[PDB]
Amino acid sequence: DNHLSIVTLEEAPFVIVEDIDPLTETCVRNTVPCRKFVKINNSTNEGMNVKKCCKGFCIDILKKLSRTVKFTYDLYLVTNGKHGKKVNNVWNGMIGEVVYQRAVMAVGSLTINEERSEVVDFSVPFVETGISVMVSRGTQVTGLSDKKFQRPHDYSPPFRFGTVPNGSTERNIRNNYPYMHQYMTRFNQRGVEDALVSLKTGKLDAFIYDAAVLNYKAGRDEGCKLVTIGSGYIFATTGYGIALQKGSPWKRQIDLALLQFVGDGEMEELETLWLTGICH
Amino acid sequence: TRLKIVTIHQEPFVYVKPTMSDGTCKEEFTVNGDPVKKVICTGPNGSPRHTVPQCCYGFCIDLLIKLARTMNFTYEVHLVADGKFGTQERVNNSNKKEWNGMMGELLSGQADMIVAPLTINNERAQYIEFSKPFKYQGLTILVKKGTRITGINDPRLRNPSDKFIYATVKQSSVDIYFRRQVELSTMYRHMEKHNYESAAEAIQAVRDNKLHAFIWDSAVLEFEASQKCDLVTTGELFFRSGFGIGMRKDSPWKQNVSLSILKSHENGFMEDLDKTWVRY
Ligand SMILES: O=C(O)c1cc(=O)c2ccc(Cl)cc2[nH]1
Numbered sequence: 231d232n233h234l235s236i237v238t239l240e241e242a243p244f245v246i247v248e249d250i251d252p253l254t255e256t257c258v259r260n261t262v263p264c265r266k267f268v269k270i271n272n273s274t275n276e277g278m279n280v281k282k283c284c285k286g287f288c289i290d291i292l293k294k295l296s297r298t299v300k301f302t303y304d305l306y307l308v309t310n311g312k313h314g315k316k317v318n319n320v321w322n323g324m325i326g327e328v329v330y331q332r333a334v335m336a337v338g339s340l341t342i343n344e345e346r347s348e349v350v351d352f353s354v355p356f357v358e359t360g361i362s363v364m365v366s367r368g369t370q371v372t373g374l375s376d377k378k379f380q381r382p383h384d385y386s387p388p389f390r391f392g393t394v395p396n397g398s399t400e401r402n403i404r405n406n407y408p409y410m411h412q413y414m415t416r417f418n419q420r421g422v423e424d425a426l427v428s429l430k431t432g433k434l435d436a437f438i439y440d441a442a443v444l445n446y447k448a449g450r451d452e453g454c455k456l457v458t459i460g461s462g463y464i465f466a467t468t469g470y471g472i473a474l475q476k477g478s479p480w481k482r483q484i485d486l487a488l489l490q491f492v493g494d495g496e497m498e499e500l501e502t503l504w505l506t507g508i509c510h
Numbered sequence: 511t512r513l514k515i516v517t518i519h520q521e522p523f524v525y526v527k528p529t530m531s532d533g534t535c536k537e538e539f540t541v542n543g544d545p546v547k548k549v550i551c552t553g554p555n556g557s558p559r560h561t562v563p564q565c566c567y568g569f570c571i572d573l574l575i576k577l578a579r580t581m582n583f584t585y586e587v588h589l590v591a592d593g594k595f596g597t598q599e600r601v602n603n604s605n606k607k608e609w610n611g612m613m614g615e616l617l618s619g620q621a622d623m624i625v626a627p628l629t630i631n632n633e634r635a636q637y638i639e640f641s642k643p644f645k646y647q648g649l650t651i652l653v654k655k656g657t658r659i660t661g662i663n664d665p666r667l668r669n670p671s672d673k674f675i676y677a678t679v680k681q682s683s684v685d686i687y688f689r690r691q692v693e694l695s696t697m698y699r700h701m702e703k704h705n706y707e708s709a710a711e712a713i714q715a716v717r718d719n720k721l722h723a724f725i726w727d728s729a730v731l732e733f734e735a736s737q738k739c740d741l742v743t744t745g746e747l748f749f750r751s752g753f754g755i756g757m758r759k760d761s762p763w764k765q766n767v768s769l770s771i772l773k774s775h776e777n778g779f780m781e782d783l784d785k786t787w788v789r790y
Pocket residue numbers: 520521523595596627628629630682683684727729730
């Protein structure tokens with residue numbers, strides 16, 4: 231068939247989830263239908279698929295691939311985890327939906343890394359990302375190898391920095407910098423908006439996270455007081471890709487379509503439309 | 511069994527210098543103090559193309575040495591005989607199209623791998639396999655220190671006049687890219703009045719206030735701003751893409767080359783090459 235199950239995850243501006251208009255029960259404008267499984271209560275696992283609408287940069291990518299590669303789709307939001315983590319040797323999140331064949335492809339702010347590429351096939355990257363470091367203007371740090379991060383108890387008071395756990399950023403820090411990682415779990419942040427609030431009010435000195443999201447947040451920080459270090463510098467450069475099952479037949483035609491959007495200027499215009507900010 | 515690697519002279523990714531009078535490579539050192547790793551690469555210097563052994567080094571050579579040790583293969587390097595990256599050109603009589611340059615050598619089996627700053631794009635990916643990018647790049651603008659250009663959407667570029675002259679290299683990949691985009695027609699028309707024959711000449715004209723802005727590869731331009739401190743890059747990158755290693759379809763090395771590149775991004779090896787060869 232060419233009707234595909236596709237999974238995504240909310241993360242502005244890549245994927246933004248909205249309520250459907252109640253009278254019409256239709257998604258209009260630049261949005262597309264998506265469903266999210268929502269539990270009735272905490273005692274059992276009975277639940278309802280709620281009809282929502284989805285928009286954003288990755289959704290515009292999905293709409294373009296659907297026309298060019300010639301498929302239709304049932305988009306749903308992942309509810310078992312987030313982007314993807316191997317937990318007790320079992321992948322959850324969007325990666326897990328693809329590994330375990332509930333989804334033919336995962337679309338969103340999904341970072342390409344080595345361990346995920348052993349269990350899924352990724353498209354070419356369609357947006358550059360990596361790891362950036364956000365601080366309040368004036369906070370001085372050189373990069374991920376700053377001694378303040380690498381050996382934090384060499385300093386008094388110790389530098390306060392954290393990430394949002396369970397994604398590719400935390401996985402990367404765990405693999406390369408064991409002391410830094412175990413130190414920073416004290417400052418784990420539930421999500422990006424918690425972390426920005428913690429920075430602006432001096433409860434946190436630095437927030438380490440996906441470069442594409444941080445550079446977007448910096449570009450519309452109110453007051454332009456939050457900045458990424460090194461003028462938007464990206465460590466461990468990679469990209470977001472579409473995840474497909476190993477050996478998927480869609481991979482070649484998705485890759486070529488994404489590269490065609492690059493060569494026709496369409497990727498440039500989508501970045502300008504969704505990822506521009508006022509601050510600089 | 512020895513992989514035939516083809517590459518091209520393109521600083522700072524691949525430098526090409528003569529051998530010493532005994533036929534060895536001269537001992538040299540990087541800023542960081544480490545010895546520069548050099549490999550012998552044969553190739554030329556309507557003329558006859560006498561192939562003679564030369565020295566090759568830089569970002570791409572460092573990468574090759576790492577991939578070879580990592581994936582356990584031996585290699586011999588030569589310079590592309592016609593000196594081109596690779597475009598499709600019509601054979602005489604309008605029979606078919608044939609790839610020239612590194613692309614033609616890879617497809618005809620004169621090489622097994624392209625290790626070069628080879629832009630990933632749709633036309634090439636139809637015919638060869640690219641790794642995941644080993645370097646994410648795009649276009650930026652080189653200007654005299656002091657000059658304020660926000661990027662490709664700056665009014666002095668969108669609304670051109672003789673008061674602010676900008677240009678690229680004639681018949682380069684950039685020139686071709688601009689010519690194909692209808693939304694850039696106004697910009698192409700101004701550039702074709704002023705395009706230069708080589709990057710070196712355009713960079714010199716920026717120095718001598720005959721060109722106000724040079725549109726080119728960001729990696730090259732950041733390398734240039736590192737050296738000559740009267741020039742800077744300015745504005746957000748645009749028309750982003752990446753360089754990939756090129757292999758033939760269903761080559762047995764494709765997946766492991768890509769995983770090794772992802773690994774080297776994630777463990778800081780690639781950022782270390784960026785520091786050694788691209789920025790200062
Ligand atoms: O891959 C291509 O076709 C191509 C064309 C260029 O002019 C060029 C210039 C500089 C660099 Cl670092 C890479 C390049 N790649």
